[PDB]
């Protein structure tokens, strides 16, 4: 909307759609963990069809990532262990 | 250096780090229930290193398209 402060999360994914897509093949969720290239993350490929900017997660960390699950920090092509998260 | 503990669905994963469990089969689990066994490698006196084809920051190809070390996985396509 006004700013990127109002940016939407990406498609949901994983078990019960309890995760959110952090990249085309990362599906994370605070109660879920992160799936990197697994089947649960497959749905995240669908986001590249949407004509609209998304960004999952709230708290920045690592190299342009946001705290994707407990202890993990994901951008759209990596997930590092990161205690900040 | 022996490969690290097996982990994940039907033993077809290797532990790459205390919370990472990858299989060329399954992909990678980072901090999921699948990757919980990888903790247990802290209890074994022998050093390990799963995977074999080297990539990125001191890591090995973990799954199709994925390079992991003991604390990170990165979409990395030489793998």
UniProtKB/Swiss-Prot annotation, chain A:
Give the species: Bos taurus
Q: Gene encoding it?
A: AVP
- From the entire protein, which fragment is shown? 32 to 116 of 166
Instruction: Name the residues that span the membrane.
Output: none
Task: Name it.
Answer: Neurophysin 2
Top-down, what is the taxonomic lineage of the species of origin?
A: Eukaryota, Metazoa, Chordata, Craniata, Vertebrata
| Disulfide bridge partners, by residue number | 10-54, 13-27, 21-44, 28-34, 61-73, 67-85, 74-79
